[PDB]
Amino acid sequence: MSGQFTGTGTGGDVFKVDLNEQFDRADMVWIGTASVLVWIMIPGVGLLYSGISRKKHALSLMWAALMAACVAAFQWFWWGYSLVFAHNGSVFLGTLQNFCLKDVLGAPSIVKTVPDILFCLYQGMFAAVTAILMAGAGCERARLGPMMVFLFIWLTVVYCPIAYWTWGGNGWLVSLGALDFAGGGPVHENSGFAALAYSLWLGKRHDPVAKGKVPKYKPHSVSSIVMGTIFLWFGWYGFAGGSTGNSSMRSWYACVNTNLAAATGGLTWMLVDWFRTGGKWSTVGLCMGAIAGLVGITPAAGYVPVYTSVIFGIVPAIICNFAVDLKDLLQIDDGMDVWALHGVGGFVGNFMTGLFAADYVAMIDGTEIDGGWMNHHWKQLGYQLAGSCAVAAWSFTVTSIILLAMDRIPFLRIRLHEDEEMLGTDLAQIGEYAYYADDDPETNPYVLEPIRSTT
Amino acid sequence: MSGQFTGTGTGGDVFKVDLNEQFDRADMVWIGTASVLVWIMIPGVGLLYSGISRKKHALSLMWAALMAACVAAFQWFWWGYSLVFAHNGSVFLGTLQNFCLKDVLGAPSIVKTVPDILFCLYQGMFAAVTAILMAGAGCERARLGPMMVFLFIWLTVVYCPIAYWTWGGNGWLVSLGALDFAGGGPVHENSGFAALAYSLWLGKRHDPVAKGKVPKYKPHSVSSIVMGTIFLWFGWYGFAGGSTGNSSMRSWYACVNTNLAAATGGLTWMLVDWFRTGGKWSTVGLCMGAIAGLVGITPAAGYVPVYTSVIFGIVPAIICNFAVDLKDLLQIDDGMDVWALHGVGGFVGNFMTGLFAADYVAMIDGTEIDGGWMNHHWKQLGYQLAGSCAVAAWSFTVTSIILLAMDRIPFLRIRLHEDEEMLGTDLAQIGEYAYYADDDPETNPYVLEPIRSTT
Amino acid sequence: MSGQFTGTGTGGDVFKVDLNEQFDRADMVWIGTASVLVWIMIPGVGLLYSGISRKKHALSLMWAALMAACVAAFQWFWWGYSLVFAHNGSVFLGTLQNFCLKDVLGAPSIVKTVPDILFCLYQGMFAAVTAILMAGAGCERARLGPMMVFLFIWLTVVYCPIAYWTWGGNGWLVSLGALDFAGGGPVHENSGFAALAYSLWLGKRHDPVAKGKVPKYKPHSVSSIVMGTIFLWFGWYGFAGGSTGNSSMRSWYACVNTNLAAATGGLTWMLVDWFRTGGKWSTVGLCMGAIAGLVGITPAAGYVPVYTSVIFGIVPAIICNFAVDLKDLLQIDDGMDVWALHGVGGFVGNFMTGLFAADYVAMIDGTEIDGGWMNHHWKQLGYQLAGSCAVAAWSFTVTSIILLAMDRIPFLRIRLHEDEEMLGTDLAQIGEYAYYADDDPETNPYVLEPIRSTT
């Protein structure tokens, strides 16, 4: 009544109008397919960080990726989507108008080429990828119940505000003119500096794997590293290629850039390791460099000329390779790989987007930008820096607050203090905890949860 | 001659007309993509049931999934497609009009938005998923040759009639008005009660893993469980999202519902295990609950409001978690996990579809239904029950007949009697059977087939 | 200026025209999705050939697949795409007009339904699949630096000319009328006869695994075989289904043919092994037969009637199964599995395409061909043979030249002579090479590179 297209609410009355008439069907199919591709990045993250670990984590990140898929999907439905995309928000956050996805259907989303329900599906996968990056960064000696509560809180007050600034209709970074093609701020920079907060507050200090003359690479499972890198590179075609919101050839241009950045990242990191080790070929390094290039190109893929995409592989791979060495200077391992690849890599890619963004690349599908230094729009570089500094500041500070507030509450503390922690070898010889005898997550039906040596 | 569009046979003469003009190209692309996604559910099933097993099966279900992909694809081409979709069928079964896919091309299928050749591709994947569920349920001490003959027969006289009732142009459940969005009857309820027939006739009785005080969860391979659950959740976007037959936003609505049902299923099952074990976190339980929610939402995903999708996770996860305990009461393990998740989960989801189905959800793409209790269409619940009872009755009874008839034929008996079965340790010390020395399917080039201790 | 559609160069001025208006959006979405699917075939190849190996390769092919993805993507961007698709080529090779993908954007590609940038993405995946087939065939005792230089050279002077003959605007096989639906010449025949050149020049002679009474199947990892076969069959829907360049139902017809050829290949090979071993069921054989059928149907999938697709499974599976026995006659293992499946299988499929190709199958999307023996176009068979003989001759001869020229240059030699090769057990007891103590690529951070026993 008349139920015709409103652009608001559900978008119109399905008994009176065909809400699909507002959208190009092929735009919708590509973003639906891209959503399925982003979903498999979630176990990709878990396999990557399970395999790279120089310590045997009690919690298996391949399994924890499914936990994170569950918690993130519930959080997004409950209020995460609304806090980012309620079409009635301020410049810093949305509202609860779409609580429990009420009225999320056929109105054109902030990306006008797809309806709200499809943009909800797609952008929910980005929230889930960020959740498993965060669970991966903070997984060492984590308690599972507190970890799930932590992810729910962290998505609500760290991810959703930064996403709003980046993508929301009134978000202040959008208005400023900062460029972030595929969510490098909300996913990579954000999770990387949240990882850093974990590292400096809850990570183990003077860690035996980061202390003295110890190997930079000493992986738990190379096959897990490679399988994770496979799922991540495969899924990144949806992550970057879908960030146009349409079926135009800017989507395929973005995919070419993504593949070439991954390829030149992997080769660059391996070559850097070859110089730095005196002639060894680093299995871990090739995979880390592919990830550095994928992270590097994320803010840029739909904005930069194809030949510059090799720079988004080369330069993040070099800078991140040396960032990992900071684990030695701090003597801290926990959380630091996620910070090195996603935090440093995300900062570097965002910065370089202000150099190489081109108005004629964006205009492949009609997208209008001032451009970067390629267009002599010199001010663009400061817009990038303002966004990166704001994301890093908010993620680091608020994550720190959550971690330290939970640490003060005994049943929410995410990581026990060691003097509180009964060893699994001793739990096993108690009958109530005999299942700790099996310390191999491939056969144990139960998570080897940290237990307070107070019962 | 004139070769114009007939709606029958091949659909028209390709030298005179463009058969593609009848269809929206984006509808076709989504259903083609959805078909590829359903295909990877096939190894998903195999990995899931290989990993969950409390017994070391001689036949590897990850490998047997490829066997099932082969046998199902051949059966579907030979006559399975025709028995379901020959456009000239009765109310209980189709015909042999499309034997060896004769004349399967460009006529609009029973789903009018895609042509016959594409609907054949898509629906053939559902048959294959059901084949590996059945091979998984009956895999313990199976003989491979008899198993392949069994699957061919079972698809023909169990799957294809139930599929016809559910999807065929004249199928009686269609006419009755029963709702089954994505094939929960033909795939899940059907395979689950066929599994039950296996369990009660050919499964081992007084089984040491189900007898006395034994662990409910004792998995063969947690990594296989998790990888299977990954492929299943990823592929389920095609399974449910493609069941609209089109590129409309009802497809994406169905995907949101599927993801939220999986997410709330996984968390619910894990929480139930946490209460029931006194505080342990169940690795197996999280994955089983995701599957219970995916099964639960299958008949409902394109029919129910988004906020009700959490109920299709919560309630199947609870009921299935207690259904698994029935393995203790019966002291039978073999076949029972497939019955618990797909049979019980499929029944519960189908039942709840009669409660929560809504005419305004179906109408997102113009689909016309009376609705469920959400529309005060109280009679809908009895239509659901009639379908579930008919599927369970046919699958249980006819599977029982096939299994017991094959058991009476020495060269077709699917599972040897134990008193007929030479132990692999003794075969190994015979020179003709020395390859039984390697009882690990990761390195053995040969299936460790059960051998009659009569040669 | 006027910047309107030119059909050349970038295709027009993005500030004046919408280059996307030239293309059906759903055609573009399917080819973008198909590109992502071909990408996962790359690790598919690596897992397959890592798992089938009867020798423990020091270089892990699952990891080397990512290396090959990197080197192939760079080579394609640098000049590989231009050497195949520069719209200004001769009848044997392209040019450097699109060096570093200059001007590759919105002009219609040689496949007029997609733009250059998308055809570049798609066809680059075929180059990468061929790169990992070649790295797999030559992986035994390979040195990694020389291998990467070899792949770059081999793509440039073996792959790119054969691809040009097959797909280029003026390619001589195109003009002759040879049929090759999905690149069976450039990918399978080419890599298979390049593998053969490796086998006969650099492979080990009188090899203990191929000499005397030794098992035909003795795999390194059955799970790797199965996972590789999963990724290959899943990805082949993009490989074959995308080779129409469009969203028509010829794409879905091609997928039905691909699935049925894989299915009948797998069953046929397993049955042949069952007869030939006296009743054993071959795990490796089922997977090899699926690959033989996938290779067999590649030149044919969009050209032959559905019922003939079973012949593209049966006949390649039989001929390839006996081709593998040639490893016994030669007493050579290295490289020969890639030749047997891709070289022999590719030749057989190409040959049979001249028998079974049908003008009424091609015309499903308007494609015009004379047809094969199904249309009494008897000359078609000689066109197939001319292409297969030219591909095999060029690939074998030029690969031989590259391998033997690199062998003469000490720092480029791909495989050390054994008398040059220090054993890993002795390297380990040197302090500079102690990391050779860990000969298991699952935990070693470094490739176990062959070292000259001269330092």
DSSP bridge pairs for C184: none
Dihedral of the CA atoms A442, A444, A449, A453 (nearest 10)?
-130
User: Distance of CA B233 to CAs A43, A128, A255, B227, C235, Å?
Assistant: 11, 14, 24, 10, 18
Nearest CA in chain A to C247: A26
Would you call B63 and C226 a contact, using CB atoms and an 8 Å cutoff? yes
- Encoding tokens for residue C167? 């797909």
Task: Closest CB to C66: pick one of A27, A223, A229.
Answer: A229
Amino acid making up residue A306: V
Would you call C39 and A223 a contact, using CB atoms and an 8 Å cutoff? no
Would you call A366 and C124 a contact, using CB atoms and an 8 Å cutoff? no
Does the CB of C275 have a partner CB in chain A at under 8 Å?
A: no
Chains A & B: contacts with CB separation below 8 Å: 166
* Cα–Cα nearest to B286, from B339, B217, B352: B217
Please say whether the beta carbons of A68 and A60 come within 8 A.
no
* Cα–Cα nearest to C327, from C209, C225, C220: C209
Nearest CA in chain A to C76: A260
Please say whether the beta carbons of C59 and C447 come within 8 A.
yes
Sign of the torsion formed by the C-alpha atoms of A431, A435, A436 and A439? positive
Beta strands in A314-443 (DSSP E): none
DSSP bridge pairs for A108: A115
Q: Chains contacting C with at least 3 CB pairs below 8 Å?
A: A, B
Task: Closest CB to C25: pick one of A24, A256, A283.
Answer: A24
* Cα–Cα nearest to B267, from A415, A79, A74, A155: A74
Sign of the torsion formed by the C-alpha atoms of B118, B122, B123 and B125? positive
Tell me the HSE value of C93 on the side-chain side, using a 13 A CA sphere: 13
Nearest CA in chain A to C12: A364
Q: CA-to-CA distance for C9 and B441, rounded, in angstroms?
A: 55
Would you call C124 and A283 a contact, using CB atoms and an 8 Å cutoff? no
* Cα–Cα nearest to B67, from B142, B121, B118, B117: B142
Chain centre distance of CA B12? 34
Question: What backbone torsions phi and psi does residue C143 show, to the nearest 5 degrees?
Answer: -95, 135
Would you call B233 and A106 a contact, using CB atoms and an 8 Å cutoff? no
Q: Return residues 57-76 of B near A (CB < 8 Å).
A: none
Method used experimentally: X-ray
Does the CB of C108 have a partner CB in chain A at under 8 Å?
A: no
Cis-peptide into A2, omega within 30 deg: yes
DSSP bridge pairs for B28: none
Chain centre distance of CA C273? 25
Does the CB of C215 have a partner CB in chain A at under 8 Å?
A: no
Task: Closest CB to C20: pick one of A230, A234, A365.
Answer: A365
Q: CA-to-CA distance for C77 and A306, rounded, in angstroms?
A: 9
Residue C45 CB partners (closer than 8 Å, separation 6+): C61, C65, C129, C132, C133, C136, C228, C232
Question: What's the DSSP call for residue B218?
Answer: -
Beta strands in B331-411 (DSSP E): none
* CB contacts, 8 Å: B62 with chain C: 223, 226-227
Q: What is the largest CA-CA distance in chain A?
A: 75
Q: CA-to-CA distance for A240 and C36, rounded, in angstroms?
A: 12
**Exposed e or buried b per residue across C141-174, where buried means at least 16 C-beta atoms within 10 angstroms of its C-beta:** bbbbbbbbbbbbbbbbbbbbbbbbbbbbbbbbbb
CA distance A74 to chain B (A): 7
B103 Rama sector, left if φ>0, alpha if ψ -120 to 50, beta otherwise? left
User: Distance of CA B321 to CAs A408, B208, B282, B310, B348, Å?
Assistant: 35, 21, 12, 17, 13
Would you call A63 and B286 a contact, using CB atoms and an 8 Å cutoff? yes
Chains B & C: contacts with CB separation below 8 Å: 165
- Encoding tokens for residue B32? 């083609």
Sign of the torsion formed by the C-alpha atoms of C320, C325, C326 and C332? positive
Question: What backbone torsions phi and psi does residue B142 show, to the nearest 5 degrees?
Answer: -70, 145
Does the CB of A101 have a partner CB in chain B at under 8 Å?
A: yes
Would you call C70 and A263 a contact, using CB atoms and an 8 Å cutoff? yes
Q: CA-to-CA distance for A328 and A336, rounded, in angstroms?
A: 11
Would you call B445 and C263 a contact, using CB atoms and an 8 Å cutoff? no
Please say whether the beta carbons of B261 and B309 come within 8 A.
yes
Residue B419 CB partners (closer than 8 Å, separation 6+): none
Cα angle C123-C125-C129, degrees, rounded to a multiple of 5: 125
Does the CB of A40 have a partner CB in chain C at under 8 Å?
A: no
Please say whether the beta carbons of B297 and B258 come within 8 A.
yes
Does the CB of A126 have a partner CB in chain B at under 8 Å?
A: no
> How many structural domains comprise chain A?
1
What is the CATH classification number for the domain harbouring C24?
A: 1.10.3430.10
Does the CB of C405 have a partner CB in chain A at under 8 Å?
A: no
- Encoding tokens for residue B403? 């299994």
Would you call B280 and A77 a contact, using CB atoms and an 8 Å cutoff? no
Please say whether the beta carbons of B137 and B82 come within 8 A.
no
Q: CA-to-CA distance for A193 and A134, rounded, in angstroms?
A: 10
Could you please report the per-residue DSSP string of B302-328? TTS-GGGHHHHHHHHHHHHHHHTTHHH
Resolution in angstrom units: 1.6
Cα angle B135-B140-B146, degrees, rounded to a multiple of 5: 55
* Cα–Cα nearest to A253, from A262, A240, A265, A266: A240
- Encoding tokens for residue B269? 């099952």
Q: Return residues 141-200 of A near B (CB < 8 Å).
A: 144-145
Residue B24 belongs to what domain range?
Answer: 1-455
